[PDB]
Design an enzyme around this catalytic site. Structure first.
Site, PDB file in Angstrom:
ATOM      1  N   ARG A 134     -10.751  58.002 -18.890  1.00 53.67           N
ATOM      2  CA  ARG A 134     -10.582  58.481 -17.490  1.00 53.67           C
ATOM      3  C   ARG A 134     -11.604  58.038 -16.467  1.00 53.67           C
ATOM      4  O   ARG A 134     -11.267  57.927 -15.262  1.00 53.67           O
ATOM      5  CB  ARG A 134     -10.550  60.012 -17.515  1.00 53.67           C
ATOM      6  N   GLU A 150     -12.200  61.058 -22.295  1.00 55.85           N
ATOM      7  CA  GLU A 150     -12.975  61.174 -21.073  1.00 55.85           C
ATOM      8  C   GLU A 150     -13.510  59.815 -20.641  1.00 55.85           C
ATOM      9  O   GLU A 150     -13.571  59.520 -19.466  1.00 55.85           O
ATOM     10  CB  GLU A 150     -14.121  62.216 -21.147  1.00 55.85           C
ATOM     11  N   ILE A 170      -5.691  65.152 -26.469  1.00 53.21           N
ATOM     12  CA  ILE A 170      -5.573  65.036 -27.925  1.00 53.21           C
ATOM     13  C   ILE A 170      -4.769  66.204 -28.444  1.00 53.21           C
ATOM     14  O   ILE A 170      -5.105  67.370 -28.173  1.00 53.21           O
ATOM     15  CB  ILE A 170      -6.954  64.970 -28.574  1.00 53.21           C
TER      16      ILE A 170
END
Ligand SMILES: *[C@@H]1O[C@H](CO)[C@@H](O)[C@H](O)[C@H]1NC(C)=O
Length: 246
Positions: free
Chosen positions: A163, A160, A71
């Protein structure tokens, strides 16, 4: 653009947002069946915009570097905000140029500096869909200390989760009740770069890591990942940071 609305959100719609987020990140190959993020992307194509709506329908737009899911900054009404680091400063050349004012936050985007700014590690910050709604509302009213905590929530619930499937699932379990992240969750976040590197090195090494990666598992136990047959590789990680950026 990818989009998520907290109004009426449930595990399914959050799953679809995270799917959309992953699908917006370009890649030319898979390494062991996992998308490999690009070494670089030139110009404005480098950045993805995520439109997030809180429960009352207010919105922020978040800028994400598509090569590393970082970000860089966000837009809230007519004010843009970027992290205090060169990559963010570069992103500010391409996104949110229509903002009436641009604020540079007084920290970089990495977890260590965010936790310092927030007054607390992320072991102690509850996450989930309600916390995400809260974080969106927070980022609407500039307060730099509050924003650091909001940004820890945002990064975990978006990047996250993109991912790692395990983290996406954690957030789905916290659809209607926040809870501090599991140890395993923290472990995975902290290991992304390393895992991404070792998965890439395993190609040309018969699926074996050159250096083992230590994680904490769902019960709290420290475990070593040595090769691509681990469930972390086959059924968890969804995106690899390119070793060119490691
Ligand atoms: C690799 O890890 C597995 C767990 O997936 C372990 O049981 C096995 O002994 C290791 N295999 C190799 C080839 O290193």
């Amino acid at each position: 653009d990818v989009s998520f609305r907290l109004s009426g959100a449930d595990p399914s719609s959050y799953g679809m947002f995270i799917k959309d987020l992953r699908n917006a990140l370009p890649h030319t190959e898979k390494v062991y069946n996992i998308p490999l993020l690009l070494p670089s992307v030139s110009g404005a194509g480098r950045y993805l915009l995520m439109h997030l709506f809180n429960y009352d329908g207010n919105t922020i737009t978040v800028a994400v570097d598509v090569t590393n899911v970082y970000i860089m900054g966000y837009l809230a009404l007519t004010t843009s905000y970027f992290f205090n680091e060169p990559a963010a400063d570069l992103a500010s050349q391409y996104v949110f140029r229509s903002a009436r004012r641009k604020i540079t936050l007084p920290y970089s985007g990495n977890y260590e500096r965010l936790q310092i700014a927030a007054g607390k590690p992320r072991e102690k910050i509850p996450i989930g869909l309600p916390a995400l709604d809260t974080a969106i509302s927070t980022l609407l009213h500039y307060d730099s200390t509050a924003a650091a905590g909001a940004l820890l929530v945002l990064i975990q619930t978006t990047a996250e989760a993109a991912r790692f499937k395990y983290i996406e699932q954690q957030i789905q379990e916290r659809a209607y009740r926040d809870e501090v992240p599991s140890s395993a969750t923290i472990s995975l976040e902290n290991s992304w770069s390393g895992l991404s590197k070792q998965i890439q090195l395993a190609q040309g090494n018969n699926g074996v890591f050159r250096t083992p990666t230590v994680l904490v598992d769902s019960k709290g136990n420290r475990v070593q990942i040595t090769n691509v047959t681990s469930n972390v590789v086959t059924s968890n990680i969804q995106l690899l940071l390119n070793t060119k950026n490691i």
